[PDB]
Amino acid sequence: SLGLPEKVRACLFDLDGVLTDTASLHTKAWKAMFDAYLAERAERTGEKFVPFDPAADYHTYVDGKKREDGVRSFLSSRAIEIPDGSPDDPGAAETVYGLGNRKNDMLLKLMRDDGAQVFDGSRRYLEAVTAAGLGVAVVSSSANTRDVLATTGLDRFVQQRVDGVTLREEHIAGKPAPDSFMRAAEMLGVTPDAAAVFEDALSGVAAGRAGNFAVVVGINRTGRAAQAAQLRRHGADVVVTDLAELL
């Protein structure tokens, strides 16, 4: 059954933290950027410095979202708003795009050091879904999704991709809007009531629920009950610590 109802004919996976062991790299890059930006703010304004919490702040405000939505959402949680700027703003600019580019510069530095690794259980699950003849899409906010799927070889399991480039070029609202999962379902030729969503991000689980997908599977690798509770509260039908728990 692969943990799925019989009506499910396709699986939609997030990338970082679901298929590849790359969520900690993104989290490190987000925290390092935001700590430096917030400390630089405190130097300018005299406001109290409060670091970026790589658990609660990442999971609530950043995880899964379009990069610039993650910037705006975390900043808003601190009662900070800055101009959006332009997509090619340098990382030194105090704009939403600038901070996103600053984080992306960080991420690429970390990624070139230690390349993306696949979770063994995720490889097993993709092999099982593929052997069962189910469609597979990857739906991620990360702009590097195509490259990650290529270097890991996971692209051999994936028929459709909606990633950070797709969101920008097709003007698709990111998670927690359901729109990017619905675009992937459409590319796969299935309706949401015939599709399963696999997500480690609270925003992504909420997107799956908002899209009325047949099953929303949350992934909790934190080892803490609190994130599993949040995944269920945000709309996950199933929570696993690893996809192999469904085999």
- With both helix axes pointing from N to C terminus, report the angle between 225-233 and 202-210 in degrees, rounded to the nearest 10: 20
Give the Cα separation of 216 and 165 in Å (integer): 24
120 annotated binding-site participant: no
How many CB atoms within 10 Å of residue 12? Answer: 31
Q: How near is the Cβ of 106 to Cl ion at its closest, in Å?
A: 11
41 is in an annotated binding site: no
Q: Are 83 and 222 in contact (CB under 8 A)?
A: no
Binding range to Cl ion, per CB under 5 A, among 20-28, 74-82, 157-165, 192-200: 157-165
Which of 123, 115, 114, 164 minimizes the C-alpha distance to 19? 123
- 16 labelled catalytic: yes
Q: How far is CA 80 from the centre of its chain?
A: 23
Per rule CB under 5 A, is residue 67 in the interface with Cl ion? Answer: yes
Q: Which is nearer to Cl ion, 3 or 178 (CB)?
A: 3
Q: How far is the CB of 143 from Cl ion (least distance, A)?
A: 4
Cα 41 to the chain's mean position, in Å?
27
- Comparing CB distances to Cl ion, the nearer of 67 and 146 is 67
**CB closer to Cl ion, 142 vs 152:** 142
Question: How crowded is residue 77: how many other Cβ atoms within 10 Å of its Cβ?
Answer: 13
Q: Does 165 bind Cl ion (CB under 5 A)?
A: no
**Residue 176 preceded by cis peptide, ω within 30:** yes
Does position 238 interact with Cl ion (CB under 5 A)? The reply is: yes
Contacts (CB under 5 A) with Cl ion, residues 117-156: 142-143
| 101 assigned binding-site residue | no
Task: Pick the closest to residue 2 from 120, 161, 122, 119 (CA basis).
Answer: 122
Minimum distance from residue 70 beta carbon to Cl ion (Å): 9
**64 is known to lie in a ligand binding site:** yes
Q: Give the count of residues interacting with Cl ion (CB under 5 A).
A: 5
164 sits near Cl ion (criterion: CB under 5 A): yes
CB 235 within 8 A of CB 242: no
Shortest distance, position 145 Cβ to Cl ion, whole Å: 9
179 is in an annotated binding site: no
Q: Compute CA distances 149 → 129, 142, 143, 186, whole Å.
A: 17, 11, 12, 21
Coil, strand or helix at 11? strand
For Cl ion, the closer CB: 185 or 217: 217
The catalytically annotated residue of 14, 57, 63, 163 is 14
Closer residue to Cl ion (CB): 46 or 223? 223
Does position 2 interact with Cl ion (CB under 5 A)? The reply is no
Where along the sequence are the contacts to Cl ion (CB under 5 A)? 67, 142-143, 164, 238
Known binding positions:
14, 16, 64, 67, 142, 144, 200
List residues forming the annotated binding site for Mg(2+): 14, 16, 200
Query: Catalytic residue positions?
Result: 14, 16
